[PDB]
Design a protein around this ligand. Sequence first.
Ligand SMILES: NC(=O)C1=CN([C@@H]2O[C@H](COP(=O)(O)OP(=O)(O)OC[C@H]3O[C@@H](n4cnc5c(N)ncnc54)[C@H](OP(=O)(O)O)[C@@H]3O)[C@@H](O)[C@H]2O)C=CC1
Length: 320
Amino acid sequence: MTNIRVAIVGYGNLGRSVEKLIAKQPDMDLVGIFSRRATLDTKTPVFDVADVDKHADDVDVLFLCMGSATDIPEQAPKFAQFACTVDTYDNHRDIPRHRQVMNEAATAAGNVALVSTGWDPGMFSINRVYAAAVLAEHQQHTFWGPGLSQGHSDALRRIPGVQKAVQYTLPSEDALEKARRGEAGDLTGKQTHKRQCFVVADAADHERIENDIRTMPDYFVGYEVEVNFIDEATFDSEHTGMPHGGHVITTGDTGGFNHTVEYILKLDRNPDFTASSQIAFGRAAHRMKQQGQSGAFTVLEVAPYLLSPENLDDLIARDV
Ligand SMILES: NC(=O)C1=CN([C@@H]2O[C@H](COP(=O)(O)OP(=O)(O)OC[C@H]3O[C@@H](n4cnc5c(N)ncnc54)[C@H](OP(=O)(O)O)[C@@H]3O)[C@@H](O)[C@H]2O)C=CC1
């Protein structure tokens, strides 16, 4: 058994998660980390991202863990010419373009690029397509959370007087139920999710801050909001985590008979589950290349069995 040689590009939250999780794999060897920074807090060999071309023959798959916002769009295609790549790119409106670009790079180099893996895009995208394909006439919605929202948290932190803050996006239990019954067709995004804020500020600024939040356009205006002014000690203790998750609910009618399909994710640590998904798809990319395949693919184009470290025969005999 020849293990798959993998490397990590970008050492942030995701990068640390995949590094830590590769040890739990029976068929993978971490060759090193390609970073823009020289000094990293790890015993794993660190290399300059500029020297990827010099290790092209020591690596089978590159786990791209840089920022989706800017890094991915411009850097990703370059790495596809050196080995199979796996990213968790999440800009939905840019995925078709990303795929086309990654496909040209991967095809030319003869590698396989797995784009937009993770839980969303990723696992949620898969369930969305499966549930919609099965239930011809259907209604579908995806709720996010309970979970930390980085975008909304930043809006909170930029309010004058806020020392520390975090906001959790929580799906409205009322909206979830309606969706399960198939009566959520007419619900706005303003009523499917609730917003919970935890702010650390001087008691004298509480009245204003609370009002700034409730009237903040786009972010909180029109939503059910709940503000909590906690002690710094309480914040550091129970609000320095990265939890997340969500629900993908699909309902359908088969002639006077309703069917509900619900996929739920409860993650204690977002980067850990994302890394787990990315890794599994890393195994799939390698396998696909072996089978003579090349190009860029989404999670919708890989047969399920490809992500598993077990042989197909064991899977069919035990899990089908
Ligand atoms: N599809 C999905 O379900 C999901 C996708 N994602 C995507 O995955 C990505 C995850 O990145 P994440 O680790 O959370 O974010 P970070 O910002 O922590 O990591 C981003 C990049 O910035 C760099 N950098 C990291 N830490 C530092 C630092 N301390 N000082 C200076 N530079 C640093 C890194 O590159 P370098 O080491 O080279 O400096 C790293 O690759 C996101 O962009 C998101 O779009 C996230 C969750 C889910």
